Amino acid sequence: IFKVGDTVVYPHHGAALVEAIETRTIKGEQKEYLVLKVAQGDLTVRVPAENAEYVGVRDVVGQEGLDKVFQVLRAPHTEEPTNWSRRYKANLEKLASGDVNKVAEVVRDLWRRDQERGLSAGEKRMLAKARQILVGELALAESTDDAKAETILDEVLAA
Amino acid sequence: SFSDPRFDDVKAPVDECKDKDMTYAAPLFVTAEFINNNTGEIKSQTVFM
Amino acid sequence: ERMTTQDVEAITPQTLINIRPVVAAIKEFFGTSQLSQFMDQNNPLSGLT
């Protein structure tokens, strides 16, 4: 499933590069760890390939994916609970899921909000983190260069 | 966990710190390491201390 | 404290470690402590002594 050099995606930290399949044993049991580093936090993560899907590392997302979320990003009709605390906790859990469809839903909903109202410091940071990880995900999904991916994401928001 | 304290160079020399009232210092870098027991990871960084 | 309240599979030692009480302890040692004394240099002998 996993090979070296794979630009693999990992919640919540976006995509990452695998560096080696580490044979670091524990209790005489040579688990096949995999050293895996991101660019933003500058941290290296080692995960056993057995429960790699349990912790939820997941391959880079193909084309069905792009328009799928685009279609989610171009989806109309989206409304939220009126109290904003439920809204905040709900889409906070949606970002905590780390699924690309839900992250795209969060960023397009928050884009429709701050395009309209002008929101909040916490909601601005809520947009900023999700935008960063979604831009990194699409920029390694289509493999088209973080700034250029920012520009094409700003292209698809105006629709 | 923590490991490996390590300095950089100083950020400004002695006379410049004494003139411009800066404290003559140097940064601390500490390799931290977060480990979850149940799933099993390490989270290693280089934290500005 | 925030090892519990933070959600698991989300956090990192960048998000755990707070360096503000660390740097404050050093600054309140070198400033305002009766052993962090002011350098008494009116000649090299008292500077040494």
User: Quick check: A99 contacting C, CB < 8 Å?
Assistant: no
Q: Which residue has the tokens 């895996």?
A: A36
Pairing assessment for the beta strands A15-22 and B2-7 based on DSSP bridges = unpaired
**CA-based torsion, A103, A105, A109, A112: positive or negative:** positive
From residue C9, give the alpha-carbon distance in Å to each of A31, A97, A136, A158: 20, 10, 19, 34
Residues A35 and A65 in one domain: no
H/E element, C45 = helix C44-48
Residues A130 and A72 in one domain: yes
Residues A73 and A134 in one domain: yes
Residues A35 and A104 in one domain: no
Q: What is the DSSP string of A93-109?
A: HHHHH--HHHHHHHHHH
Residue where a domain stops, chosen among A59, A86, A107: A59
Residues A73 and A146 in one domain: yes
User: Quick check: A128 contacting C, CB < 8 Å?
Assistant: no
Residues A93 and A39 in one domain: no
Residues A97 and A37 in one domain: no
Q: Which residue has the tokens 């710190």?
A: B17
- The alpha-carbon radius of gyration of chain C (Å, integer) is 20
Contact criterion met (CB below 8 Å) for C10 and A96: yes
Residues contacting residue B5 through CB under 8 Å, at least 6 positions apart: B28, B29, B30, B49
Contact criterion met (CB below 8 Å) for A47 and A20: no
Nearest alpha carbon to residue B46 among B25, B32, B34, B27: B32
Which chains neighbour B (Cβ–Cβ under 8 Å, 3 or more pairs)? Answer: A, C
The approach used to solve this structure was cryo-EM
Residues A92 and A145 in one domain: yes
Amino acid at A7: T
What is the nearest CA distance from C4 to chain B, expressed in angstroms?
Answer: 12
Nearest alpha carbon to residue B40 among C30, A159, A33: A33
DSSP class of A59? P
Residues A46 and A119 in one domain: no
Residues A70 and A142 in one domain: yes
In total, how many domains does chain A have? 2
CATH number of residue A128's parent domain:
1.20.58.1290
Contact criterion met (CB below 8 Å) for A123 and A114: yes
CATH number of residue A4's parent domain:
2.40.10.170
Return the number of other C-beta atoms located less than 10 Å from residue A145's C-beta: 12
From residue C44, give the alpha-carbon distance in Å to each of A36, A101, C48: 57, 72, 6
Residue where a domain stops, chosen among A14, A34, A59: A59
Facing residue for C9 by CB, picked from A41, A43, A55: A55
User: Quick check: A125 contacting C, CB < 8 Å?
Assistant: no
Nearest alpha carbon to residue A12 among A118, A134, A119, A124: A134
Residue where a domain stops, chosen among A38, A59, A80: A59
Residues A80 and A54 in one domain: no
Residues A39 and A100 in one domain: no
Per-residue H/E/C for chain B: CEEEEEECCCCCCHHHHHHCCCCCCCCEEEEEEECCCCCCCEEECCEEC
Amino acid at C11: I
Show the domain range for A22: 1-59
CA A66 – CA A138 distance, rounded (Å): 8
**Burial group, residue A46, by CB count within 10 angstroms (0-12, 13-18, 19+):** buried
